[PDB]
Amino acid sequence: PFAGDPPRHPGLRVNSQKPFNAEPPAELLAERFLTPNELFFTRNHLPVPAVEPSSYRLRVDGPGGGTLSLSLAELRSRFPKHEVTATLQCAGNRRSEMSRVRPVKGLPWDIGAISTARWGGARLRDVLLHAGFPEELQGEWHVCFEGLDADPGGAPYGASIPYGRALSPAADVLLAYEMNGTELPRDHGFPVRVVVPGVVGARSVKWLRRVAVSPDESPSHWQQNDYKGFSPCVDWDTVDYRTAPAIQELPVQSAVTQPRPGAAVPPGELTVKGYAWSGGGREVVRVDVSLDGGRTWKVARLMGDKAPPGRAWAWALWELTVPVEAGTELEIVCKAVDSSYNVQPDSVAPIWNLRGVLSTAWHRVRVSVQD
Amino acid sequence: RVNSQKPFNAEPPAELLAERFLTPNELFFTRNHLPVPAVEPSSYRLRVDGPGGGTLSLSLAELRSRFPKHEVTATLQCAGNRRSEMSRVRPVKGLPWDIGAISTARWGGARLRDVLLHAGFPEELQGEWHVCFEGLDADPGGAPYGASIPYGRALSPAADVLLAYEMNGTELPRDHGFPVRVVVPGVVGARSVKWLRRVAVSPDESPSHWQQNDYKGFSPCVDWDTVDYRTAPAIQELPVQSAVTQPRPGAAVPPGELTVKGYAWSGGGREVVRVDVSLDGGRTWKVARLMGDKAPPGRAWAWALWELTVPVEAGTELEIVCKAVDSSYNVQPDSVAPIWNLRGVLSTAWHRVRVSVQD
Ligand SMILES: Nc1nc2c(c(=O)[nH]1)N[C@H]1C(S)=C(S)[C@@H](COP(=O)(O)O)O[C@H]1N2
Ligand SMILES: Nc1nc2c(c(=O)[nH]1)N[C@H]1C(S)=C(S)[C@@H](COP(=O)(O)O)O[C@H]1N2
Numbered sequence A: 001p002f003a004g005d006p007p008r009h010p011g012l013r014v015n016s017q018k019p020f021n022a023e024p025p026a027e028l029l030a031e032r033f034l035t036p037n038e039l040f041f042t043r044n045h046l047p048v049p050a051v052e053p054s055s056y057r058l059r060v061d062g063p064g065g066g067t068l069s070l071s072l073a074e075l076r077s078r079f080p081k082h083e084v085t086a087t088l089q090c091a092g093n094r095r096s097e098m099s100r101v102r103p104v105k106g107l108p109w110d111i112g113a114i115s116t117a118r119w120g121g122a123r124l125r126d127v128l129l130h131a132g133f134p135e136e137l138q139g140e141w142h143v144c145f146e147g148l149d150a151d152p153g154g155a156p157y158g159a160s161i162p163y164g165r166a167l168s169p170a171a172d173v174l175l176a177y178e179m180n181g182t183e184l185p186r187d188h189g190f191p192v193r194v195v196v197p198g199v200v201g202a203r204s205v206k207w208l209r210r211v212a213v214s215p216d217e218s219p220s221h222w223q224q225n226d227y228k229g230f231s232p233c234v235d236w237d238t239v240d241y242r243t244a245p246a247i248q249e250l251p252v253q254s255a256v257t258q259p260r261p262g263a264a265v266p267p268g269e270l271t272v273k274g275y276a277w278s279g280g281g282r283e284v285v286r287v288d289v290s291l292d293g294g295r296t297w298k299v300a301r302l303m304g305d306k307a308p309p310g311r312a313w314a315w316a317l318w319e320l321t322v323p324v325e326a327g328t329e330l331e332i333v334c335k336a337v338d339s340s341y342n343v344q345p346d347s348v349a350p351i352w353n354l355r356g357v358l359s360t361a362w363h364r365v366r367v368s369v370q371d
Numbered sequence B: 001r002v003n004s005q006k007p008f009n010a011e012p013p014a015e016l017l018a019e020r021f022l023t024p025n026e027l028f029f030t031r032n033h034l035p036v037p038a039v040e041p042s043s044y045r046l047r048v049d050g051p052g053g054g055t056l057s058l059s060l061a062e063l064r065s066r067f068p069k070h071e072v073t074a075t076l077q078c079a080g081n082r083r084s085e086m087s088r089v090r091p092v093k094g095l096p097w098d099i100g101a102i103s104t105a106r107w108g109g110a111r112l113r114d115v116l117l118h119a120g121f122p123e124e125l126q127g128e129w130h131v132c133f134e135g136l137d138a139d140p141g142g143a144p145y146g147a148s149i150p151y152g153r154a155l156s157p158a159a160d161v162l163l164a165y166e167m168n169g170t171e172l173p174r175d176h177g178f179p180v181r182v183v184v185p186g187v188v189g190a191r192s193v194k195w196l197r198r199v200a201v202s203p204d205e206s207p208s209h210w211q212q213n214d215y216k217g218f219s220p221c222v223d224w225d226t227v228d229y230r231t232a233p234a235i236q237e238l239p240v241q242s243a244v245t246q247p248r249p250g251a252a253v254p255p256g257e258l259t260v261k262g263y264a265w266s267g268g269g270r271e272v273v274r275v276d277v278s279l280d281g282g283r284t285w286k287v288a289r290l291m292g293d294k295a296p297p298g299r300a301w302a303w304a305l306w307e308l309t310v311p312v313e314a315g316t317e318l319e320i321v322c323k324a325v326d327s328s329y330n331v332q333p334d335s336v337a338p339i340w341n342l343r344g345v346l347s348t349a350w351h352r353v354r355v356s357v358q359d
């Protein structure tokens, strides 16, 4: 089934080959603000579709039973191209930290199941208004997405977002056909993927074949029975996915990319660097950094341009240059605060869950200073 | 429970705080910075400074008759709620609130959106604009209480911002802003300006002391000699919060069953999706039952009241802890020291209550 999959950069840390899942090494992760296409993390549940672009058609089911069938050419020409810089973070980012507390079910991601790119495409809003849908519906409606990738029986990958997000101009939801100025790579949804800014990676459906408006959420296995958070007391014999909401917006998150665990850094000065981000378009307003395991803190410098309010879809790269004394031991910890003053919890055990998702307790890195 | 008399500031006893979903008007916590105005209703006018230089001046009668009344159930939480937990770590400056600087009511008024539109402003302005508010209460110098919110929140239909003249079906009490106050749902109590005199649209935030030099969060490392209010944003939306109202600290409860109760709430219209309760100081957890009716997505302005009934052995010690999770899966931090700040605001670490079980 995976014979036709695309070639991938080797540098990427591969945690699953069939289907292909891989993350960039931490030492490359936050070198640039936009993550290069060949190192942007990859999460595939199924074999990668091989799509011929000229015959490709996007099906959008119209409001009274009609159907709109869009070629790539129309998707590009009929709707004004919008570009949005947005970070995708997988729900399982930093899963490994949670697994060490107690084994979980999921891909063993470290801190790199997150990448940033400048996306371009048709606004989902413009496409749905074109198909005949109104700006607002009575009650709770959803927009469902289906991919061209399918399981043995033929069930495709699928997901949904609330209709209000789909139709909001400010939410900047795209039917993306460009990534960092080039056509979408195969691994990243060629020819067309959904990009949902501020929202968990799982809803940004790749190799999009269909868009439908429904009174209910997508019935996909990954919408109904995956990507939810549970109490740490829940285990496999008690988990009941009907008791929790689908992950949409994500909580505030941060990690240290430099230095790396085990490093013996030279004395004098040390530049600690990392990334921080929060869901829902909430900007990172402060990143606190400790060198003594969280007893004392210093304020990092936030690199990057401010985005408009509520539209902070891209991560904040941060740094802190600090003097270091030969022979000393450092425990580097980071924590970020967002625009609603949400914060990261101290520890992992109270936020533990059986699938190892929503891992946002403070990141901790042990290094020493060369004698 | 009064922690200041002149001016007046007070919170309901925890035994009454969460008995009812809507907090009675006589119980609703009160935060006043300045003397309470005695506003004479007939000559009262709300001034709204229009886009061109004009002034829309509205009487209370006009406010009620020209705009369709909108009702919104919303919880107000003060920035200093649970300040006493901050103080326990290191001394802070501020009113010594416990867990009761939070209350809920059904607000009734005109939409701020409709008033601004009525005055000729547009649905959107390019760039970051603000809507500023001034109260009739004033300091010795004569400076009034003031605050602002971003223009986009003020004009959003979904944001439910009101110029309220009713509170739980009765006219606004004096202590709660008679005849009119701003109610900003999902936003810190500070921006809900009471005894409203004026509404203005500006390219900049309100220049008021409480908007510029108060109600911000800082790194725990900041102290009075290094604090710089320019380095942090004004608090608007608040983070996820919870507390235990029953039992009380130091209690000795009878063996058999125990019903733990409390409240949970999050800012920005984010509903509370779960409340985890521990009886062993945070080692193990159980899921509480949430009492409430869901609000539409993004419009959960009111708290969720919760309870858990659990067996308790005779002669044991309990450390009851609660933590809440919101619809964006934001969570509460374990401890206070790492969220400490010099004003003791934004106190949202887990609430811990110790009790013993009788023999
Ligand atoms: N059709 C399709 N879309 C999908 C996937 C999937 O398996 N199939 N995986 C999802 C999840 S879980 C993640 S985290 C993101 C990853 O996007 P990326 O590989 O471009 O980083 O894609 C989402 N889109
Ligand atoms: N005019 C004016 N309004 C104000 C106040 C103020 O002192 N004067 N205090 C503010 C703050 S800090 C709080 S927490 C809330 C409290 O409202 P309440 O007294 O009706 O509970 O009102 C806000 N509105």
Ligand SMILES: [Mo]
Residues within 6 Å of the ligand: A043, A089, A090, A091, A092, A201, A202
């Ligand atoms: Mo994911």
Ligand SMILES: [Mo]
Residues within 6 Å of the ligand: B031, B077, B078, B079, B080, B189, B190
């Ligand atoms: Mo307040």
